[PDB]
Amino acid sequence: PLMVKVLDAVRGSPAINVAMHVFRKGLTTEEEFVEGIYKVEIDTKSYWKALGISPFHEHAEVVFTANDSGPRRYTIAALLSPYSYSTTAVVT
Amino acid sequence: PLMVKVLDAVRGSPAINVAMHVFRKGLTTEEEFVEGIYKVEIDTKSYWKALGISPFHEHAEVVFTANDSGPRRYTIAALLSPYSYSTTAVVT
Amino acid sequence: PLMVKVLDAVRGSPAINVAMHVFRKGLTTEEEFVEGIYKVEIDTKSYWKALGISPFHEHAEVVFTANDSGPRRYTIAALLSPYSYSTTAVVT
Amino acid sequence: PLMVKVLDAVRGSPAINVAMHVFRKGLTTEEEFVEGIYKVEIDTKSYWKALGISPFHEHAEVVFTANDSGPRRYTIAALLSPYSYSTTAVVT
Amino acid sequence: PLMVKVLDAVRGSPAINVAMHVFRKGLTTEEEFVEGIYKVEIDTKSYWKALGISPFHEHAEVVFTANDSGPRRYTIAALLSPYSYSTTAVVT
Amino acid sequence: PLMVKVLDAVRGSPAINVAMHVFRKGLTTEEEFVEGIYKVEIDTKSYWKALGISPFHEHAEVVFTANDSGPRRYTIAALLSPYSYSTTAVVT
Amino acid sequence: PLMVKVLDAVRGSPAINVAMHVFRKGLTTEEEFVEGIYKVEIDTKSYWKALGISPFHEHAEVVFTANDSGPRRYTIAALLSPYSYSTTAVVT
Amino acid sequence: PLMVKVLDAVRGSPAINVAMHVFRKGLTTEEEFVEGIYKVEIDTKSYWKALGISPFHEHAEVVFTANDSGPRRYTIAALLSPYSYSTTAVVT
Amino acid sequence: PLMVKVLDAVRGSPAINVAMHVFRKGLTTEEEFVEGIYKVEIDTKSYWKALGISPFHEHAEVVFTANDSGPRRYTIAALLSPYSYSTTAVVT
Amino acid sequence: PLMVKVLDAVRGSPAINVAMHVFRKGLTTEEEFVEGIYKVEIDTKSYWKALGISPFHEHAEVVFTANDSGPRRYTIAALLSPYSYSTTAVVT
Amino acid sequence: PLMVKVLDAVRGSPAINVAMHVFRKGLTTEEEFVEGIYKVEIDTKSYWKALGISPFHEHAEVVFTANDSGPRRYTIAALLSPYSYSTTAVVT
């Protein structure tokens, strides 16, 4: 007789992020899983992933170069941070 | 007799994000999963993924170059952050 | 006798995002899954994906170059962030 | 006797996004799935995907160049963020 | 005896987006699936997809160049964000 | 008779992030796992991952160079930090 | 008769991050695990991971160089630190 | 009859981080574990990890060089340190 | 009849980090553990880890050099140190 | 009838870090352990760890050099030291 | 009938670090242990650890040199030392 009670009585004006999971009971294999529920990804980089079976098997001559140079500005305010009765100013 | 009770009584004006999962019970394989419910992806990069079976198997001469240069500005305010009785100001 | 009760009584004017899953029970393989429920993708890049079976199998001479330069401005305010009794100003 | 009760009584003027899934029970394979319920895509790029079986199998000489330069401005306000009794102002 | 109850009593003037799923039970294959329910695509780009079986099989000499330059302005306000008793101004 | 009671009575306007998990009971294999519930990734880099079975098996001559140079500015304020009756100010 | 009681009565406006896990009971193998619930990653780098089975098996001549140079500024304030009745200023 | 009582009565406006785990009962193998719940990663580097089975097995001539030079500034204030009635000021 | 009572009555505005574990009862093997839940890692470096089984087994000629030079400044204030009624100033 | 009572009555505004573990009852093997509850890592270095089984087994000629030179400044104030009614000042 | 009572009544604003463990009852083997509860590691170095079984077994010619030179400044104040009604200045 499992019972879960969440934010039953809310009197007011909150700022809320609620993540709940209820569970009652082949290069890359993933099964029965929970991933990136509130995941935030900024300027992520993946070059070579899961190329495959027997790639470049014989007499491969590869030249791999990755140049991550760049003038980049992101400037996030209040990332994944709920706020209440509050002021968020991004001024440039 | 599983029972889940969430935000049953809300008196007021909140700012809410609610993610709830209730569960009662081949190069890339993924099964019976939940992913990227609130996934936020900004300027993500994937170059080579799952090319396949026996790619470049024999006598391959590849030249892989990735130039991630660039003048880029993102400037997000209140990302994935619910707010109440609040000010979100982006000024440039 | 599974029972789920969410936001049963709402008195007021909230700002709400509600994501709720109730579950009772070959280069890429994907089964019985839930993906990108509230997914946000901004300036995402995928160059080579799942090329296939035996691509460039013999005597391939490839020249792969990716130039991610560029003057780009995004400037999002209140991304995936419900707000109430609130002011969102984007001024340039 | 599964039972789901959502937003049963709403007294007021909320701003609501509701996604609910209730479930009772060959290069790319996807089965019995839910994708992009509230998915948001901005300036996404996919160059080469699922080219096929035995592409460029023998003596291929490819020149792949991708130039993602460009003067681009997006300027979204209140993306996927319901708001109530609120101001959303985009001024340029 | 599955039962789903949503927004049974609404007293007021809300702004609502309602997605509800009730489920009781070939290079690219998708089966019994749900996709792009509220998916939003802006300036998305797909160059080469599912070219086919044995394309460029022998002695192919391809020159692939993609120039994503361009003066482009999008300027969306209140994307996928229902609002109530609210003001949305896009001024240029 | 498991019972979980969280934030049952909330009188006021808090700023809350709630992650709650209730559980009652092949190069890379991941199963029965929960990951990235609130995980945030900024400027993460993965070059070569899960290349495959027997890659570069015989007489491979690879040149791997990764240049992570670049003028980059991130400038996040209030990352994953809910705030109440508060000011979040990013000035440049 | 396990019972868990968390933040039962909250009178006021706190800033809260709460993570709770309830549990009642082949190169890389991880199963039945809960990882990176509130994990934050900034400028992380992984070059070669899980290359595969018998890579560079015979007569490999690799040149691996990683240059992590770069003018980079991050400047985070209030990372994973909820604050209340407080002032967060990032000034440059 | 295990019972856990945490922060039952909170009168005021604290700044709180709460992690609670309640438990009642092959190169890399990890089982039934909880890892990096509130882990913070800044400028972490992993070069070669889990290359695989029999890599560089015979007559390998590798040149591994890692140059971690770089002008980098991080400048975090209030990392994983909730604060109340407080000032967090980053001035440059 | 195990019973745990923590911070039952909190009158005021403290700054709190709460980590509580309640427990009632193959190169690398890791079982039934909790590791680095609130561990924070800054500028950590791991070069070669778990290369694999029989790497460089015969007639290997490796040149391993690691140059950890670099102009780097971190400048953290109030790391993992909650503060109350307090002022945190980082001035450069 | 084990009973644990911690910080039952807190009247005031303290700064608190709380770690409590309550417990009632193959190169690297670790079982049923707790690690890095408040673990802090700064500029840690691990070069060669768990290379594997029979690495460099026969006729290996390795040249291992590690140069930990570098202009590096860390300058942490109030590390893992909660403070109340206090000033934390980093001036350069 | 074991009973533990800690900081039952706290009237004031102390600065507290609380670590309590309550316990009622193959190259490297580690069992049922507790490590690095408040561990702080600064500029720690581990070069060769657990290389493996029979490494450099026959006719190995290794050259191991470790140069720990470097201009490095750490300058921590109030490390793992909670303070109350106190002033912390780090001035350079």
Numbering used by the authors:
A (entry chain G), B (entry chain H), C (entry chain I), D (entry chain J), E (entry chain K), F (entry chain F), ...: 11 to 35, 57 to 123
Q: What do the paper's sentences say?
A:
Systemic amyloidosis of the ATTR (amyloid fibril protein derived from transthyretin) type is a potentially life-threatening disease that is caused by the misfolding of the circulating blood protein transthyretin (TTR). TTR is a naturally tetrameric protein with a very high β-sheet content. One TTR chain consists of 127 amino acids and the native tetramer acts as a transporter of thyroxin hormone or retinol-binding protein in the blood. Well over 120 mutational variants of TTR are known to give rise to hereditary ATTR amyloidosis with Val30Met being a particular important one.
ATTR amyloid fibrils were isolated from the hearts of two patients with type A Val30Met ATTR amyloid fibrils. A three-dimensional (3D) map reconstructed based on the cryo-EM images achieved a spatial resolution of 2.97 Å based on the 0.143 Fourier shell correlation (FSC) criterion. The fibril is polar, possesses C1 symmetry and consists of a single, twisted protofilament. The larger density segment fits with residues Gly57-Thr123 of TTR, the smaller density with residues Pro11-Lys35. Weak density occurs adjacent to these ordered regions, suggesting that residues Gly1-Cys10, Ala36-His56 and Asn124-Glu127 are structurally disordered or absent. The fibril cross-section shows a relatively compact protein fold that resembles the shape of a spearhead. There is an internal cavity that is lined with polar and ionic residues and probably water-filled. Stacking up the fibril proteins along the fibril z-axis generates the cross-β-sheets. All cross-β-sheets have parallel strand–strand contacts. In the N-terminal arch, an extensive hydrophobic core is formed by two leucine, one proline, one isoleucine and five valine residues as well as the variant position 30. The fibril protein fold differs profoundly from the native conformation of TTR-Val30Met, which contains nine β-strands per protomer along with a single α-helix.
